[PDB]
């Protein structure tokens, strides 16, 4: 019966138009505050000195 | 007795003038909404992608 997308290709839709796009919206630079990162890498060094 | 067509060739009539014509009136493009068909073939593909 011709109707709303369901059953089969609706899941295809879920795995592309929904899911694929959803992931495309994520970050890739999200959370990357330069200054906070500079702090983070200072923390990564820790108690020692670094070259 | 010469009268209304009956008995024999009346059935011939049924199998041609009635039946044959009746079938000739059916479709052949009936129900074929291009857009609904496009939906149908998307359904025919189902959850997978298609080439």
């Amino acid at each position: 019966e011709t109707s709303e997308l369901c059953g089969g290709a609706r899941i295809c839709y879920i795995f592309h138009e929904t899911f694929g796009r959803t992931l495309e919206s994520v970050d890739p630079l999200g959370g990357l505050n330069t200054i906070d990162i500079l702090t983070a890498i200072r923390n990564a060094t820790g108690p020692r000195p670094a070259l």
Side-chain angles (χ1 to χ4, degrees), chain A residues 20-46:
Chain A
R21 291 191 190 280
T22 297
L23 290 185
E24 283 293 302
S25 76
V26 178
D27 300 324
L29 295 172
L32 301 187
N33 179 344
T34 300
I35 300 302
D36 291 345
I37 292 168
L38 289 172
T39 298
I41 64 174
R42 284 194 293 270
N43 287 338
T45 297

Side-chain angles (χ1 to χ4, degrees), chain A residues 5-19:
Chain A
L5 189 68
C6 67
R10 178 65 175 268
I11 294 171
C12 191
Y13 180 102
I14 290 169
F15 288 153
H16 292 88
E17 295 300 314
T18 298
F19 175 61

